[PDB]
């Protein structure tokens, strides 16, 4: 990733950011109700969000 992302528009990257923040909410509830077997997912989502926001920022900045 980070290239697959960099080649989306600002419209699309906002959509994906929402999608990730929703996934993130759902994982949180799962984990919190002891239903998350795959603990590792949280960090990948958390970091995807970063990547997406880091790209929005670089596109706005210039």
């Amino acid at each position: 990733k980070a290239k697959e992302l960099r080649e989306k528009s600002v419209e699309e990257l906002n959509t994906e950011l929402l999608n990730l923040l929703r996934e993130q909410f759902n994982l949180r509830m799962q984990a919190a109700s002891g239903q998350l077997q795959q603990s590792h997912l949280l960090k990948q989502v958390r970091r995807d969000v970063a990547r997406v926001k880091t790209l929005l920022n670089e596109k706005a900045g210039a």
Partner: protein, 93 residues
Amino acid sequence: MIREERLLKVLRAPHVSEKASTAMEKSNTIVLKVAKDATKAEIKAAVQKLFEVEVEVVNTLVVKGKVKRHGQRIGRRSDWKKAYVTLKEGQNL
């Protein structure tokens, strides 16, 4: 009262306990951990959009984290916010 990015971050977890189970059976009220800086309005909107049920009223308190000693040193758990979110009579989930 809302913007979706914020609403998604406001509810942290179900809280489980006898008091919370009874609050559901007896009063159609669900008990939650919510963001510390969350307001009753945010909590209400958030619950209503995400869990897609109608909210009557939200009550909230702040829990002080317990301290634990360790020989000469202390550790301190975090304060958090508890939300008693009452659903309207036509109960859901």
